[PDB]
């Protein structure tokens, strides 16, 4: 049900892959959310300063 | 137990969490390390046999 | 002094001009090479001690 919008322009993942997400078994999850400008989307990566 | 730079030390976790085009370089680091650890073992037995 | 396929032979420059997500695998190439060159030196001493 996540795949509903067409312009999901950032969905790449670091430790997992979108194909294997439905066959895994997570210990616990958290969902953090915020609203930023469009230029700062690439500023969220491990070690990516900005 | 040594990871050799891979994200895990068990081969059934690399294939179950990420795609095939990325595991070809993750597991290649594990194979060329475990093959090196077996070549060091045999080359010490030739010394002991001599 | 040899780079062993890395970008530099000094450890301080590795953690300066590249992303923190790549710094783990970049310096891991160098430690395996130096451990390989240390494995070559010892296995010549086992022959010489015979």
From Swiss-Prot, chain A:
Known outcome of mutating residue 10 to A: In strain: Omicron/BA.2, Omicron/BA.2.12.1, Omicron/BA.4, Omicron/BA.5, Omicron/BQ.1.1, Omicron/XBB.1.5, Omicron/EG.5.1
Role: Attaches the virion to the cell membrane by interacting with host receptor, initiating the infection. The major receptor is host ACE2. When S2/S2' has been cleaved, binding to the receptor triggers direct fusion at the cell membrane. When S2/S2' has not been cleaved, binding to the receptor results in internalization of the virus by endocytosis using host TFRC and GRM2 and leading to fusion of the virion membrane with the host endosomal membrane. Alternatively, may use NRP1/NRP2 and integrin as entry receptors.
Region of interest called Integrin-binding motif, as start-end residue ranges on this chain: 37-39
Subunit structure: Binds to host ACE2. RBD also interacts with the N-linked glycan on 'Asn-90' of ACE2. Cleavage of S generates a polybasic C-terminal sequence on S1 that binds to host Neuropilin-1 (NRP1) and Neuropilin-2 (NRP2) receptors. Interacts with host integrin alpha-5/beta-1 (ITGA5:ITGB1) and with ACE2 in complex with integrin alpha-5/beta-1 (ITGA5:ITGB1). May interact via cytoplasmic c-terminus with M protein. May interact (via N-terminus) with host bilirubin and biliverdin, thereby preventing antibody binding to the SARS-CoV-2 spike NTD via an allosteric mechanism.
Protein name in UniProt: Spike protein S1
Species in which this protein is naturally found: Severe acute respiratory syndrome coronavirus 2 (2019-nCoV)
Residue window of the full protein shown: 367 to 416 of 1273
